[PDB]
Amino acid sequence: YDIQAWKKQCEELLNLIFQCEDSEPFRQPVDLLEYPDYRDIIDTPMDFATVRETLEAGNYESPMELCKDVRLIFSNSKAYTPSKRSRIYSMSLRLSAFFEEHISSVLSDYKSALRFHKR
Ligand SMILES: O=C(NC1CC1)c1ccc2c(c1)OCO2
Numbered sequence: 001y002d003i004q005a006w007k008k009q010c011e012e013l014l015n016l017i018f019q020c021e022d023s024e025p026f027r028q029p030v031d032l033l034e035y036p037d038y039r040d041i042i043d044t045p046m047d048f049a050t051v052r053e054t055l056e057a058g059n060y061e062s063p064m065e066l067c068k069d070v071r072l073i074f075s076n077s078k079a080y081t082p083s084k085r086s087r088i089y090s091m092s093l094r095l096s097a098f099f100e101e102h103i104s105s106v107l108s109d110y111k112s113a114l115r116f117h118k119r
Contacts, residue, residue, distance in 0.1 A: 001116040006063040007055065009106045013099070014052050020098065022091040023048060026073050030080075041080055046072040063106050070099055 017023050029047045030038050038045070051069050060066045074096045081089035 001113040003110070003113045003117055005113070006106050006110045007060075009109075010055055010060075010063055010066050011052075013102050013106070014048060014055070016102070017048060017095065017099065020095060022095040022098075025088045025091060026077070026095070030076075035080070038080065042076050044072060044076070046070075046076060048073065063103070063110050067103055067107065070103075071096075074099075 018027065026048050028049050029045055030042075032038055046069050048070075051066060051073075054060055054069065055066060074092050077089050077092035083089070
């Protein structure tokens, strides 16, 4: 029932994501010189360095907020892809599956701890 445990759990998950070769296109903000029309399609850019920095600054209150930003990385890749078979989008799908598999217990434990706190 530790209400704070999610933070280190998220730091360790981000470390795993950075070791995954599938995270390469998402480790830093999308380069507008490489993808000139990016901001014509994507309203809110997001990347894993920004997520890690927000967490380390103490600017996430819960793992649900971190999860929303990580999911935005994947939805941006889906919205920008010219094809469902594209390399970067295909990497986003595998990384998404890996993230979802690992974040599930973080979310469940945090929500359970918070319900216990408010019992
Ligand atoms: O989201 C994309 N790029 C940013 C992560 C760096 C992205 C997705 C699919 C593509 C693509 C780019 O180029 C050809 O197919």
